[PDB]
Amino acid sequence: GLVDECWRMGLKILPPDINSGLYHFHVNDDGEIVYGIGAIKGVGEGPIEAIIEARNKGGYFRELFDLCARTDTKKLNRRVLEKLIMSGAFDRLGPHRAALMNSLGDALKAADQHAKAEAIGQLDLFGVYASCQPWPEQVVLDGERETLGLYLTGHPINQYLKEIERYVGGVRLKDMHPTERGKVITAAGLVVAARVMVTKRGNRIGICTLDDRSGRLEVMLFTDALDKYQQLLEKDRILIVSGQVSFDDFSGGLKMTAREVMDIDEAREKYARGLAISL
Amino acid sequence: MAAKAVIRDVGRVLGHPYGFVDRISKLIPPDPGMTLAKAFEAEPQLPEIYEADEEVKALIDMARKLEGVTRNAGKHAGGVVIAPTKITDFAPLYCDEEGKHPVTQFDKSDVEYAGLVKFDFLGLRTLTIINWALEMINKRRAKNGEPPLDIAAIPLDDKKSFDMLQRSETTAVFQLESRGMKDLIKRLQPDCFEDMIALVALFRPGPLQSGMVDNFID
Amino acid sequence: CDLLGDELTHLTVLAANNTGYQNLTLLISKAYQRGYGAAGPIIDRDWLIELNEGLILLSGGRMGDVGRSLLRGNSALVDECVAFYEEHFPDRYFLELIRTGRPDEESYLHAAVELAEARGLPVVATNDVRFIDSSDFDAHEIRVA
Amino acid sequence: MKFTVEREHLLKPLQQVSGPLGGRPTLPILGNLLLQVADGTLSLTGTDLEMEMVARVALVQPHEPGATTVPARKFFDICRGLPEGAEIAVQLEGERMLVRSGRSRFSLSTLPAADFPNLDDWQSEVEFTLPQATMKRLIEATQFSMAHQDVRYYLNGMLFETEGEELRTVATDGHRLAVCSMPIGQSLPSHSVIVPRKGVIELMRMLDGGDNPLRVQIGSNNIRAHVGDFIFTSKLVDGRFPDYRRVLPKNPDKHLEAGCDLLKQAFARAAILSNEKFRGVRLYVSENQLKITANNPEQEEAEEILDVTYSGAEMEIGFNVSYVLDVLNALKCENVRMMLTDSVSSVQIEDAASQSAAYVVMPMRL
Amino acid sequence: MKFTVEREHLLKPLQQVSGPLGGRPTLPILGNLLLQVADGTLSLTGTDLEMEMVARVALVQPHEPGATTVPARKFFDICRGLPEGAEIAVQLEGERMLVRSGRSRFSLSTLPAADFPNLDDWQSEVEFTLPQATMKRLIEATQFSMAHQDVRYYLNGMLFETEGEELRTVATDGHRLAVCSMPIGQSLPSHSVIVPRKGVIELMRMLDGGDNPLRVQIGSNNIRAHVGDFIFTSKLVDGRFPDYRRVLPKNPDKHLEAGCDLLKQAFARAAILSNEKFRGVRLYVSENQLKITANNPEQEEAEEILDVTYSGAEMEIGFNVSYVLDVLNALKCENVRMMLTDSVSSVQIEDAASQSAAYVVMPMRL
Amino acid sequence: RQIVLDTETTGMNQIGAHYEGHKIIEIGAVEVVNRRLTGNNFHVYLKPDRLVDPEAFGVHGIADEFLLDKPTFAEVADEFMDYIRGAELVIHNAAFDIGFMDYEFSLLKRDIPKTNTFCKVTDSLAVARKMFPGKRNSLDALCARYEIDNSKRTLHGALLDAQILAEVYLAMTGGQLSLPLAQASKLRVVFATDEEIAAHEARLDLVQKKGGSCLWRA
């Protein structure tokens, strides 16, 4: 909710950065905002402090390798490193994300070999778009949501539909017009979908996301058509619908269901679009 | 034993798997003060499954006997109390598993009625917000040598403030984040502090469904 | 107590006046400050030595120190246990007597009545009540569980 | 299908072929045996995709061809349990196999021969023959240095180097090394092949240490071993084994001997008071005197004094004691010779009088 | 504080004392031994706080009183490890124990004797001595039927009951039951005590079966065994072992006799095709014939037919084959006699020659 | 003598009377004597009087047109009654089947009382729930638990389940039996002292003056 508000108000807003980042969300002078570290789901508390501590003792980290040497694998685990890339923590340095994911292990090995040269090991016999442009936008932003919670640069289709819409979701639904169950118009910006089962049959599946930048849910008990409505529902960069809404009894998820579907073209029917040019 | 909890707990002790019982408890309305009498009036499927299902009947008959009953001490305390002498002059203690976090064995209402003055614990993190925002404002000091900022020293007629408010941009504005409340703000276009004092008192089922809000605005 | 090791017994503790009330308040605090396990907080029997005046003691019945020792049939252990209350709580320590149709109650009762006459000690009967009506037993069982 | 056999002909094959089989593998049919009667011959084939064991036993009475497959483990236990000298008559009828002996009668569920993965017949590349007892030595002297679960997958196994008139074995996990070199007495082709941990376990298992020659066929990606009419074949993995000539200490100038069993009993004892995690010990050596010390978190200490033959400079070096105890136990000798270079390089360990077995462990710095 | 003993006087004591230790000793000093030197006697205690072993050996060499507490397993292994004939010299210096042997020296951290918990001296109630052999038969014959983890924690152990000149043991699950009785040759007062399974395991392990008699003391809360100069002490579990005389079949009317070995061989083989978890096998008996049948969920089928001496009525009965093999393994006899009742009752089983052992198992009705 | 049944039907009602407006399609039962199948199976198909429900169709498959010519419950009323009368009725989810059975019985209008009045209906789920608390105790759950396949068997519907349930039932109720086993006399009466009686009087005064009653002094 907060981000949606932020965004509408302005920009930057930025991916996390191991060099610049503080304990929580921080404002550089220009940068309205930079990620707080605690935001990341997977990363431990120990690793967050480790990163900052290493940044303190060293200067800004010069490269991926330089980061890994300064903070040993013991503090910042490979699993930890993987989520940092997925967050976009490294993006500045390793413009090639794919390159950076792969380069971790080899770079870590050297650092450990420095540590080994130092202490307590057994010792050993012997012996031994991708470009300046990063990982693609669509795919990169997909990963970020999984790791952080949200899409960066706004949704894969973030930028308007408003006149139909209200973009408020559950927070709007609480105080609603009285009825059996709220009547609502939803447009889906992005959905990734199948029709699933259970080896018995099973009620599902709609995956609804509500934009502009608001909130998305599994849902959860529906169905109507059997397979025909299900596939219309399906799958990349298209949907507006009419669907009946209730506020779920259980907290932490609501009902937003597709009772009706309309196509991009059908959504373009939406009432009947008019052309507005601003000259 | 709140409505959801008592059903869950009785159902498990009656030996149903989690799935069976949750199919029932999810039909119990959300409300904070939920009781069996309230549940029966809010949800018509409850009367019906009671008469149609012997297991549900056995379960609700038992939930009726245990309705409201106290289960355990609590993840959180109720408040901090100040005695004129040692607390043991008035009550015994309860403490956690390490004998830490000592608490009065009498609750909120009872402990004070037995004569010691109390001070509430408050979880809200709006002052943490203000705190952090003040830190961040006062950093902007050395960046341009500007005096640190005193939220208490702000003028009471500020136009920026009322401009943003008349723009209805009041989500994350404390207590006034409701869509309904923003509906009201939109129509009213509130332009003074008196109106701000009024908002929370107006934004209720009574005031809205008695026309006084509309009278006031008109 | 160190006599029966880890085994917990039941005790009913009354504050008879305000001296007792303050001693009882101290005793409760002391138990919680000591810490405990899944069974909940426990007292040392010998806390009753210093934390003593204004308190009147009930033995706990079959589930008490003396009841459990009686059921074992360790006569020496029984005598040592009561002896403590005869020293520190003369006329202020009571045998609980219970006939609720539960395992060992009548056997204990018969042996406790013999002990009570042999020691000059007093008994009091309770019903160890947990519910209003007999059909509430099932609900109490569920409450405990 | 029908044949009848003498328990004693069937039993050792059954044991050799069953013994590595997990009771319950991940792919069911792998726990069953392929049974083939053709001509006067029973061929047994059981596999785990890594290795395969084939046994033949002579059918002297009337017999009838066909194909079948029964649970390996259970069949072996049944046959092990049978009375001494038992004549067992079994007959396949449809998809039930009936097992008779005397008045015992059995009926087993059956999975088809057709489902069994027929792996490939291949052309032999390098061939040689040897006593069973030499093979067992070669393997025993060396197999304990393989890793368990190291990323360098080619160390769970053994380098074969056949060159000139020699056959040589060496095994390692990156931390300790064992070499064994023995004359095979025939001119061979030049070929190298790494056979797996489980392959070496099973080859050692079937080395009934006696007279019989063992003939082995290595291919490019497969290996097969015949001793008489017991036939073992395993798949190989190919990859990049390390060069033992880079591990070999350069010219160890300093020599240190001591009596082997006294040395070993003393190391077994110092091991008890060593750090639990690394089993690490420190040796201090001086003219005709040896001082071994250890320490642990429990703040215990070990010191050993014994008389050893040592002429040379003092030296400071730490090892994991388990790793040297392993070699001292395998070496069944009187006196041993240790050849050091320095604390940071390989040390060679060997019987002062034989050279057939050689072990090198690289040291530690504590 | 000092004493010197020879390794060979310490070896059998040390072995024996180290047995009871593995308890995941949470209170760390349970992994340690109590050494007390007083007089010319070093006393050892090795204990899990429920049971205890004390041994005295006489000290012929020089000694000085005082006490210490060293870690038991590690101390046992070092001493067992020292070479044959070695004279090992121990000496406490204040808070550290020094272990010397000739020219080697070891310094171990030490926990003080004064901290070591003492279980109380108590008084005996029933007393008897007997040949080791008799105690051996008695334990071996019954121990297998003990529960491991039961709610009735008193069944995790064995009822000892004396009556006339019989000591009579029983151990059970609630499913199977073995009883063993032997002549003891001495008048015995009647007593009842339950000794914990761990106790009986250790007692079993201390019997070498040799010539030293065993002498036992039983008090109210502990039980103690003296063989010569070694002393075992355990606590007892409180009581209330259910009356085995109630469960006994009252004149089992069918008599069924067979060669123990043959019978056991057939059960072992039939067991391979039972349900792995529950081991249920079904029995058909008829005039002088025994037909065994077993089914498992995977449709596999075993059958054994055998010649069995049996006079009585025809009846069918199913049961857990593991439990009956356990008894056949405990029955060290030629032929077994089985006494039956019907398809729904437990059966009584004996050695066809001795009433000394009695076994009764419950049926499963499949 | 022990009687095993499992009836799969023309689908069910989710709420209220699961039998109201619905009818039985197949009766498939096995008769069990001395924990064995004699092989005298009673396997019959009857008149739907309505359409097979989409749910029931997906369960094990079955066409409505197949049960059209087949007789009604009235034609096998006596036949089935005598087959089960005065015997042990072991059912899974007994409330379901019994509900349908008695429903159809009343529809015949033949004075035939409810089967529960002349036959002992015992639920196996209750027993399973006692043995395995909080575990899935469905037919297919227990099937997989004891490694029985009921999915790759040609029999779909009643006869399938009946057979399987019989085997499961016997297994659970066999399983291995167990041995196991499982006033006068003189006595002092401390009477309150005069000082204690004074404290008592003062304490009752407090009760009475503050509360307006004291039953001890009534």
What is the dihedral sign for C-alpha D83, D88, D94, D95? positive
- Helix (H, G, I), strand (E, B), or coil: what is residue F151? coil
Spacing of C-alpha F23 from chain mean position: 20
Partner residue facing B88 (CB), from C25, C34, C145? C25
In whole angstroms, give the CA distance from residue E177 to residue E346. 10
Rg, Å, chain D Cα set: 25
In whole angstroms, give the CA distance from residue E272 to residue E287. 27
* Count of beta carbons in the 10 Å neighbourhood of residue A248: 18
Contacts with E243 from chain F: Cβ below 8 Å: 181
**Binding residue per annotation — E24?**
yes
Which structure tokens are listed for B95? Answer: 């403490």
Which B positions 33-62 lie with beta carbon below 8 A of chain C? 62
What is the dihedral sign for C-alpha F172, F178, F181, F182? negative
**Three-state secondary structure along E39-55?**
CCEEEEEEECCCEEEEE
Q: How far is F177 from chain E (nearest CA, A)?
A: 6
What is the dihedral sign for C-alpha B154, B159, B164, B170? positive
Q: Is the Cβ–Cβ distance between D110 and D69 less than 8 Å?
A: yes
Spacing of C-alpha F114 from chain mean position: 15
- Helix (H, G, I), strand (E, B), or coil: what is residue C57? strand
Q: Which CATH architecture has domain E124-247?
A: Roll (3.10)
* Residue in the block written with tokens 């105890």: D325
Phi (first) and psi of residue F78, to 5 degrees:
-65, -40
Partner residue facing B179 (CB), from A5, A172, A249? A172
Cα of first residue to Cα of last residue in chain F, in angstroms, is 67
In whole angstroms, give the CA distance from residue F10 to residue F22. 7
- Give the H or E element holding residue A55: helix A45-57
In whole angstroms, give the CA distance from residue F47 to residue F73. 7
In whole angstroms, give the CA distance from residue A136 to residue A130. 8
Which structure tokens are listed for D88? Answer: 């067992």
Amino acid at residue number B106: F
Spacing of C-alpha D301 from chain mean position: 37
Q: How far is B191 from chain F (nearest CA, A)?
A: 55
Chains E and F touch each other (3 or more Cβ pairs < 8 A): yes
The DSSP secondary-structure symbol of A6 reads H
In whole angstroms, give the CA distance from residue E265 to residue D72. 20
Q: Specify the long-range contacts of residues A64-71, CB closer than 8 Å, at least 24 apart.
A: A64/A90, A64/A93, A64/A94, A64/A100, A64/A103, A64/A104, A64/A107, A65/A103, A65/A107, A65/A110, A65/A111, A67/A18, A68/A104, A68/A107, A68/A108, A68/A111, A69/A107, A69/A110, A69/A111, A69/A114
The number of helices, as runs of H, and strands, as runs of E, in chain C is: 6, 4
* Residue in the block written with tokens 């010990």: D281
Which is nearest to F174 in space by CA: E325, B47, E317?
E317
Cα of first residue to Cα of last residue in chain C, in angstroms, is 28
In whole angstroms, give the CA distance from residue A67 to residue C4. 62
Question: Can you say whether residue E279 is alpha, beta or left, with left for phi > 0 and alpha for psi between -120 and 50 degrees?
Answer: left
- Give the H or E element holding residue E71: strand E66-71
In whole angstroms, give the CA distance from residue C53 to residue C84. 15
In whole angstroms, give the CA distance from residue E180 to residue E234. 22
- Helix (H, G, I), strand (E, B), or coil: what is residue B171? coil
In whole angstroms, give the CA distance from residue B1 to residue B16. 19
In whole angstroms, give the CA distance from residue E36 to residue E17. 15
DSSP lists the bridge partners of residue E172 as E177
Torsion, Cα B184 B186 B187 B192, to 10 degrees, reads: 80
CA distances from F157 to B9, E203, F12, F62 (A): 36, 60, 15, 9
Beta-strand relationship, D357-361 and D176-183 = antiparallel
CA distances from E45 to E35, E49, E68, E116 (A): 7, 10, 11, 10
Those residues with Cβ within 8 angstroms of residue B144's Cβ, 6 or more apart along the chain or in another chain: none
Chains F and C touch each other (3 or more Cβ pairs < 8 A): yes
Spacing of C-alpha B97 from chain mean position: 28
Decide if A1 and B172 are in contact by the 8 Å CB cutoff. Answer: yes
Homologous superfamily (CATH) for D1-123: DNA Polymerase III, subunit A, domain 2 (3.10.150.10)
Q: How far is A122 from chain D (nearest CA, A)?
A: 5
**Binding residue per annotation — F205?**
no
Which is nearest to E255 in space by CA: E295, E335, E312?
E312
In whole angstroms, give the CA distance from residue E82 to residue D160. 40
Q: Is the Cβ–Cβ distance between E170 and E159 less than 8 Å?
A: yes
Beta-strand relationship, E51-58 and E41-47 = antiparallel
The CATH fold assigned to E248-364 is: DNA Polymerase III; Chain A, domain 2 (3.10.150)
Phi (first) and psi of residue E351, to 5 degrees:
-65, 135
**Binding residue per annotation — F8?**
yes
Preceding residues of all breaks in chain F (C to N beyond 2.5 angstroms)?
Answer: 182
- Helix (H, G, I), strand (E, B), or coil: what is residue D279? coil
Mark out the alpha helices in C35-102 (DSSP H runs).
47-50, 65-72, 75-88
User: What is the number of residues in chain F?
Assistant: 218
Decide if E272 and D299 are in contact by the 8 Å CB cutoff. Answer: no
Q: Is the Cβ–Cβ distance between A145 and A192 less than 8 Å?
A: no
In whole angstroms, give the CA distance from residue F10 to residue F23. 6
Q: Is the Cβ–Cβ distance between B199 and B190 less than 8 Å?
A: yes
* Residue in the block written with tokens 């593991």: E322
- Helix (H, G, I), strand (E, B), or coil: what is residue B42? helix
Contacts with F174 from chain E: Cβ below 8 Å: 280, 318, 364-366
Q: Is the Cβ–Cβ distance between F80 and F108 less than 8 Å?
A: no
In whole angstroms, give the CA distance from residue D140 to residue A275. 87
Question: Can you say whether residue A116 is alpha, beta or left, with left for phi > 0 and alpha for psi between -120 and 50 degrees?
Answer: alpha
Which is nearest to B180 in space by CA: B159, B162, B205, B198?
B205
Q: Is the Cβ–Cβ distance between E68 and E97 less than 8 Å?
A: yes
Partner residue facing A1 (CB), from B28, B29, B171? B171
In whole angstroms, give the CA distance from residue D83 to residue A59. 80
Phi (first) and psi of residue E25, to 5 degrees:
-60, 115
Amino acid at residue number B77: A
Q: How far is A254 from chain B (nearest CA, A)?
A: 13
Task: Please give the full DSSP string across D307-360, using - where no structure is assigned.
Answer: --EEES--EEEEEEHHHHHHHHHH---SEEEEEE--TTS-EEEEETTT-SEEEE
Nearest CA in chain F to B55: F95
- Helix (H, G, I), strand (E, B), or coil: what is residue D301? strand
Which structure tokens are listed for E341? Answer: 């009742």
C22/B contact by beta carbon, under 8 A? yes
Q: Hey, which residues of F are catalytic here?
A: 156
Beta-strand relationship, D157-163 and D126-131 = unpaired
Partner residue facing C91 (CB), from F183, F185, F190? F190
Which is nearest to F102 in space by CA: F80, F135, F71, F124?
F80
* Burial of E187 per CB tally in 10 Å (0-12, 13-18, 19+): exposed
Q: Is the Cβ–Cβ distance between D84 and D111 less than 8 Å?
A: no
Which structure tokens are listed for B58? Answer: 């056995």
Amino acid at residue number A205: I
Decide if A171 and B181 are in contact by the 8 Å CB cutoff. Answer: no
The DSSP secondary-structure symbol of B159 reads H
CA angle A117, A118, A123 (to 5 degrees): 45
CA angle D207, D209, D211 (to 5 degrees): 115
Residue-range domain boundaries for chain E: 1-123, 124-247, 248-364
Q: Is the Cβ–Cβ distance between D169 and D160 less than 8 Å?
A: yes
Return binding residues of D for DNA: 24, 73, 149, 153-154
Which is nearest to D90 in space by CA: D104, D72, D111, D71?
D104
The DSSP secondary-structure symbol of E97 reads E
Which is nearest to B96 in space by CA: C144, C42, C34?
C34
Partner residue facing B17 (CB), from F16, F17, F134? F134
Q: Is the Cβ–Cβ distance between E216 and E224 less than 8 Å?
A: yes
In whole angstroms, give the CA distance from residue A195 to residue D164. 66
- Helix (H, G, I), strand (E, B), or coil: what is residue B68? coil
Which D positions 247-266 lie with beta carbon below 8 A of chain A? 247
CA angle E366, F6, F11 (to 5 degrees): 155
Contacts with F183 from chain C: Cβ below 8 Å: 109-110, 113
In whole angstroms, give the CA distance from residue E32 to residue E20. 12
* Residue in the block written with tokens 């019954």: E142
In whole angstroms, give the CA distance from residue E14 to residue D247. 44
Phi (first) and psi of residue D128, to 5 degrees:
-170, 160
Which is nearest to A46 in space by CA: A71, A14, A25?
A71
**Three-state secondary structure along E233-283?**
EEECECCCCCCHHHHCCCCCCEEEEEEHHHHHHHHHHHHCCCCCCCCEEEE
Q: Is the Cβ–Cβ distance between B15 and F133 less than 8 Å?
A: yes
Those residues with Cβ within 8 angstroms of residue C42's Cβ, 6 or more apart along the chain or in another chain: C8, C31, C34, C36
For helices C137-144 and B54-66, what crossing angle results, to 10°? Answer: 80
